[PDB]
Design a protein around this ligand. Structure first.
Ligand SMILES: OC[C@H]1O[C@@H](NC(=S)N/N=C/c2ccc(C(F)(F)F)cc2)[C@H](O)[C@@H](O)[C@@H]1O
Ligand SMILES: OC[C@H]1O[C@@H](NC(=S)N/N=C/c2ccc(C(F)(F)F)cc2)[C@H](O)[C@@H](O)[C@@H]1O
Ligand SMILES: OC[C@H]1O[C@@H](NC(=S)N/N=C/c2ccc(C(F)(F)F)cc2)[C@H](O)[C@@H](O)[C@@H]1O
Ligand SMILES: OC[C@H]1O[C@@H](NC(=S)N/N=C/c2ccc(C(F)(F)F)cc2)[C@H](O)[C@@H](O)[C@@H]1O
Lengths: 810, 810
């Protein structure tokens, strides 16, 4: 059908058809008279996965022979989404399978909708890990993703009476065709116990043992025949566990609860024991696996030449004292050599600046659970602080500021401080975030070791986030500039010479229109909701957090509503305002914001005077599969965090690549995005970081804004008095009180500029030719935000390895 | 190699070889350089199972088209053992796979040792269910086994310092190639709640829901291309279960614990709530599945013409009030018609007479867990007792004796009484057991409804228990009489005309010798134990129970030891005495008996004066796979339960078929076995049932025996004084006290006759030609004890369906 989806050869199509029927019969034990759509999906899935195995076996064989330096990417989250289409795309099988299934009398797109998301992450950090794995395979690096196989991923979100309900994401219910259990490689992980000191050093004894069972999932590169591995650990009780009889067997559950569920509280650090166990479990199992592989290459001096470990935030920070423990206690290296090896091996990526998100584990927890690790941490702290003392003699306050141990009511370990001390590199995830690290939160560490601090601006994979989710746009671009850009996204610059091309303009706008019709249909079909596809699609999708300022968007929405009611017979650009995202189950304010959004929808969507000039829809259960649908259909991307709070953002980049214009603050990656496209091609508004700092100095007084902006006052009055909650008039009192008296994120301060800027957006949209021309200049300059570029920078500047675009033999 | 194992055709062998390699690559994701023996087993397993699927799909298709009457065999236990060899045997693939694996450079027998036992049963009742499924498929009946998929089966037994230790049987750890999950057919099961009465009848409301997920396993007939289904239910939490957040997800475990583990307490009824839940779970899910299938045939008058439900003991007795509940409350049939349908549908098999084993559920349990079922049971009881009153007017004691409700401290439901009331047939499992039911324990019910009471003497499958475990014996028989006997075991009578055939005599004795060498080797290899293979193999294998009198065997063993020590230079027939079996974890006396056996071994096996004339070995972890090894190697089968206590026994029959002579009491099936072979060809001793009754009348005084038998006194003195426990002299005080003052099973009363009879055994064994001739007359008359015969009797006399030896088209 379309070019970039590969060849549908006669030989291939005939082969796919017969293997499909083979799987239906032998694998699924069905025949065509009993088979459901789900059976058909599984048959296709097995037919496709057959094509990975030879490539997977010989890639891993290749790494054994050539013995390159290995990259280990440690994360507690991998937000993978669906795998079928991604695999077809990366193997050039998409048109062939489409044809084969067509001739079998099936619609492949319908089968694709049956696959569950692998929802093993919360948001940006988890999705970043998934994009990175894809780029690492595409760039031919010998890379492994290591994490936990959660039985339950991020909860499915139901909206009930306007309110979020959570339900278990039982994603493994029907089986996972993309994993291979490897029970033969099961490893023991130890907990509790005590430390004994002997003549021959320390020994960790009387431990409880939990088994770590690995499951491998393939990660195919883009048409280079490379298939890397993601290894996820599952928790298993040992067989003499608790071993009246019946109870002992039932208590095996306690051990296995370690990998049962993903923590969804991305807002607020909770020092929960189960979470600590999860963090140690992935680290202990992974490091044994690493050392095993290394020993199959006594000389640990070569360890850093052969191993790189990337720590995705502080969640796997225990890798540092765990590597030390192994090297010192088990291999009997001396401390200094062990430390040298550890530092050269580990690197740390920070993904936030919000204080309440930082991991600070109570000492009494580490004492009971990991007694030997606390001792190692204490020793690291002493030696580190001795280095600080010698560099800044007499600076006693620096010492307490830099300590890994925080004193107070409860003593705590600062895991970020541990990571910086024990890593040769520390990076932020966009240029302004990295500068903020060096200037404010890790200033003392930067002064001590400026060489450690780097930037690696985030990216997204153009395979999933263009080719897969927006084939129409991929095709019209391919027609003009060829297919090479898919794995060299900088080529999109060549599109600049088409900004005045009437045909291209028409094609870009047509692709968008089709995307909007497709999504407007999806809404009616799966959610019985009626939207006008000629309106501007105004979309904000991301986790619900105060810093992300979904509330500022709410304020604009009500402003538009009030202006319509005021001058009903005046013309305004019609909008469909879509907001979506999950709230952490314990985050009251975020749950209230969701309720507000639905409450507004309830008023706005049923007002006859509004007609269909304004619609407000809450997008339920936002997740990778839904992002792949809504992003290609968007016209306006809302990226409106208070400057200084969004470390990078990556959703922003997905919208840019897919032909939406951006309204945003100079925050995170938005800055670099505006820089690449030109500030004239971006709707920038609001305080910069410096203005925020100024405001904090004087003190932020929300009342000032309320007193001087009558349009804002009106909104606040409506909220208080119960205009949006007729039956519970004080329903939103918490929200109003927060905005008026304790708003950490200065919602009111940006209100005027935001509304003004929104007027400029509406103006441009009235001129379709000029809207589309600006869109073209965005797409054309989105090349920098490919994760191939990000990963090539990690490889060269942190891990010390050269990427390669060369094919392995098929 | 050997005939009965089928053809190894050039085309077949080449096909098996390539499918093996296909599976190794695509299914296991290995290549020959990394593959372990386990990988090889799995590749063969997948290669073999491929041959079942077409047969499985068309058998079930056939039953849909022809719509025969369906047999549902309900059991909480299916002791299946291993499946690979059984499948090859039933499909005629054994020689072909042996060849194919040979040419691949593998030993198939070694691969077969890798498969775990499906240990989903305790002993005889569970193994009976497995033999029955095999015969039902072999006889072409449209039959389904329904049960629970336990995550953990019967525990593995470790012997530590002479003592039993239990460890979890994690049989699913590496995956089960013989099952197919069917999540699409998941059904809800309800618990707790309350009953509401409306105008439109009773309604069961406010229930907790647990999901039942079926797993199907094939059951192939012997070379007839029939493949029936065993469906096992697994417990799953519903997705809004408990739905702070983290805990809610972790508590899903509570629902799923229902199918976690098999109860191993075969000795003593424990009214544990979890066990009741298991019993209801299998019943509720199964009956919905049955009704579903029936409705795909309002007219429930045809229900008994289309459905038979066999209840394996009282464990699924809740099927009776559950069928009533559905028919009355949900389909709105009137009580009398519902009852008529239920009775004609259900039949009950009793597997014991021991009072402490009978299920008597406290009313307060059924009240909380199954409030509607208690009401239904009460109503059944009233109507039943009204029938009793009318038949035996004024007999008030009969009324209280026959009631389903037992009064007392705690009111209880007698589940056996429920089963008899609600079934059209009640059978025992051997002729003497069935007579005992009618004369003693169910006398009142027999007087009321004599037509209900039947006998169906147990059997074993000659596929597993001859062809599979003893190919050498199967072959030498096949040479003389052909292969037809394998599915028509009565043909073995033809062997009588060979009792004086010198060649046959020589061949029978040679097969036994090879079996003993093979087992003597297995012992040395896997357990570093040294046995003389020229000795008489004296074997008692079965669960450890007082009624089974492993203690009487212990007494004989010590007698032989004492007689040797007394006259060291006298000749005696050398013996290897092997005893094995698991004890229920809470059964103290049974655990003490195991300790005694090992303790004796410790003394006897290290006495230089004994040499190798006497060895005592405890066979660890007795289970189906071990039975398949030890039974063909046995010379003497010990079947020595107190007369009246072993309902049938089936191990007895396995030994008979495999060329061991039997020493036994006239108990259970032993009677019919002696009757078939001739009492001259059997070593019968001890009290008959009548003698036991007499002894109880006068009162059993153990002291009498102790006073009159000096050889017995000596043994008791040795036990008391600590001869077998030098470091803990009073270790066996419990055992001695039990024997002297509270022996329910009259061990001493049979002592003299037993020892005497054992002398007669030793005498015969000195004359090999005559030993073997008697062996031939046993094998030749073991035809009656085939489960094909047993099942043909159930089919004709209970279920009303005709068996068929006709092939389905391949
Ligand atoms: O879902 C049912 C079960 O299947 C099992 N898979 C087995 S037996 N073969 N896999 C083969 C395989 C082939 C190719 C690939 C891929 F995609 F190319 F990489 C992955 C796996 C899984 O181990 C188990 O966890 C799972 O629950
Ligand atoms: O760099 C990629 C993206 O990273 C994001 N950081 C995220 S998602 N941190 N998650 C923290 C977290 C903490 C605890 C937990 C929990 F619950 F304990 F399991 C889960 C997540 C940035 O906010 C974004 O600007 C950036 O683009
Ligand atoms: O062990 C890995 C997993 O495999 C799954 N099997 C799947 S996907 N195909 N089965 C095909 C099949 C073919 C033939 C037969 C047989 F023997 F002819 F009857 C049985 C099953 C199981 O459903 C799951 O419970 C299990 O854990
Ligand atoms: O007919 C076949 C054989 O059946 C046997 N009966 C057995 S095994 N009953 N099990 C009872 C039992 C009770 C409770 C439990 C438990 F633990 F709650 F789960 C398990 C088993 C007879 O004793 C034998 O003579 C006969 O040959």
């Amino acid at each position: 059908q379309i070019s970039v989806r590969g060849l549908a050869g006669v030989e291939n199509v005939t082969e796919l058809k017969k293997n499909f029927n083979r799987h239906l019969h032998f694998t699924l034990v069905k025949d065509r008279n009993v088979a459901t759509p789900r059976d058909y999906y599984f048959a296709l899935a097995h037919t496709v996965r057959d094509h990975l195995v030879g490539r997977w076996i010989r890639t891993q064989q290749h790494y054994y022979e050539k013995d390159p330096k290995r990259i280990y990417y440690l994360s507690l989250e991998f937000y993978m989404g669906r795998t079928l289409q991604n695999t077809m795309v990366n193997l050039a099988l998409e048109n062939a399978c489409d044809e084969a299934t067509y001739q079998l009398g099936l619609d492949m797109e319908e089968l694709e909708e049956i696959e569950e998301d692998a929802g093993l992450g919360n948001g940006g950090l988890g999705r970043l890990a998934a994009c990175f794995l894809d780029s690492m395979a595409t760039l031919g690096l010998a890379a492994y993703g290591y994490g936990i196989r959660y039985e339950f991923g991020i909860f499915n979100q139901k909206i009930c009476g306007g309110w979020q309900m959570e339900e278990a994401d039982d994603w493994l219910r029907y089986g996972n065709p993309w994993e291979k259990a490897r029970p033969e490689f099961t490893l023991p992980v130890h907990f509790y116990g005590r430390v004994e000191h002997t003549s021959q050093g320390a020994k960790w004894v009387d431990t409880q043992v939990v088994l770590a069972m690995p499951y491998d999932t393939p990660v195919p590169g883009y048409r280079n025949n490379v298939v890397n591995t993601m290894r996820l650990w599952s928790a298993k009780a040992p067989n003499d566990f608790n071993l009246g009889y019946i109870q002992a067997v039932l208590d095996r559950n306690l051990a296995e609860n370690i990998s049962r569920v993903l923590y969804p509280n991305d807002n607020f650090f909770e020092g929960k024991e189960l979470r600590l166990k999860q963090e140690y479990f992935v680290v202990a199992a992974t490091l044994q696996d690493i050392i095993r592989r290394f020993k199959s290459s006594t000389n640990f001096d070569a360890f850093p030449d052969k191993v790189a470990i990337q720590l995705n935030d502080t969640h796997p920070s225990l890798a540092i004292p765990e590597l030390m423990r192994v090297l010192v206690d088990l291999e009997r290296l001396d401390w200094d050599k062990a430390w040298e090896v550890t530092v050269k091996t580990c690197a740390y990526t920070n993904h936030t600046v919000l204080p309440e998100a930082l991991e600070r584990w109570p000492v009494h927890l580490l004492e009971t659970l990991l007694p030997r690790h606390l001792q190692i941490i204490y020793e690291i702290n002493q030696r580190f602080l001795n280095r600080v003392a010698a560099a800044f003699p007499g600076d006693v306050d620096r010492l307490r500021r830099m300590s890994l141990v925080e004193e107070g009511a409860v003593k705590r370990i600062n895991m970020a401080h541990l990571c910086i001390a024990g890593s040769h590199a520390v990076n932020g995830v966009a240029r302004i975030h990295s500068e903020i690290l060096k200037k404010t939160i890790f200033k003392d560490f930067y002064e001590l070791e400026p060489h450690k601090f780097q930037n690696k601006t985030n990216g997204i994979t153009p395979r999933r986030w263009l080719v897969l989710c927006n084939p129409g746009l991929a095709e019209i671009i391919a027609e003009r500039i060829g297919e090479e850009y898919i794995s060299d996204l900088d080529q999109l610059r060549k599109l600049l010479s088409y900004v005045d091309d009437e045909a291209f303009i028409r094609d870009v706008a047509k692709v968008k229109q089709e995307n909007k019709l497709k999504f407007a249909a999806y809404l009616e079909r799966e959610y019985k909701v009626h939207i006008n596809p000629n309106s501007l699609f105004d979309v904000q999708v991301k986790r619900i957090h105060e810093y992300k300022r979904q509330l500022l968007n709410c304020l604009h929405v009500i402003t538009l509503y009030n202006r319509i009611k005021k001058e009903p017979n005046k013309f305004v650009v019609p909008r469909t305002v879509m907001i979506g995202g999950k709230a952490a189950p314990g985050y009251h304010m975020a749950k209230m914001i969701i309720k507000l959004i639905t409450a507004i929808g309830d008023v706005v969507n049923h007002d006859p005077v509004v007609g269909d000039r304004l619609r407000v829809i809450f997008l339920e259960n936002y997740r990778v599969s839904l992002a792949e649908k809504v992003i290609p259909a968007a016209d306006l991307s809302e990226q409106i965090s208070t400057a200084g709070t969004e470390a990078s953002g990556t959703g922003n980049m997905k919208f840019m690549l897919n032909g939406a214009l951006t309204i945003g603050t100079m925050d995170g990656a938005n800055v670099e995005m505006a820089e690449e496209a030109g500030e004239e091609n971006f709707f920038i508004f609001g305080m910069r970081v410096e203005d925020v700092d100024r405001l904090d100095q004087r003190g932020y007084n929300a009342q000032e804004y309320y007193d001087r902006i009558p349009e804002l006052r009106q909104i606040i009055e409506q909220l208080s008095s119960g205009f949006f909650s007729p039956k519970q008039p004080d329903l939103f009192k918490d929200i109003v009180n927060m905005l008026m008296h304790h708003d950490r994120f200065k919602v009111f301060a940006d209100y005027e500029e935001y509304v003004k800027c929104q007027e400029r957006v509406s103006a441009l949209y009235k001129n379709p030719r000029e809207w589309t021309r600006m869109v073209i200049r965005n797409i054309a300059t989105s090349g920098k935000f490919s994760s191939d570029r990000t990963i090539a920078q990690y490889a060269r500047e942190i891990w010390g390895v050269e990427p390669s675009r060369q094919r392995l033999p098929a």
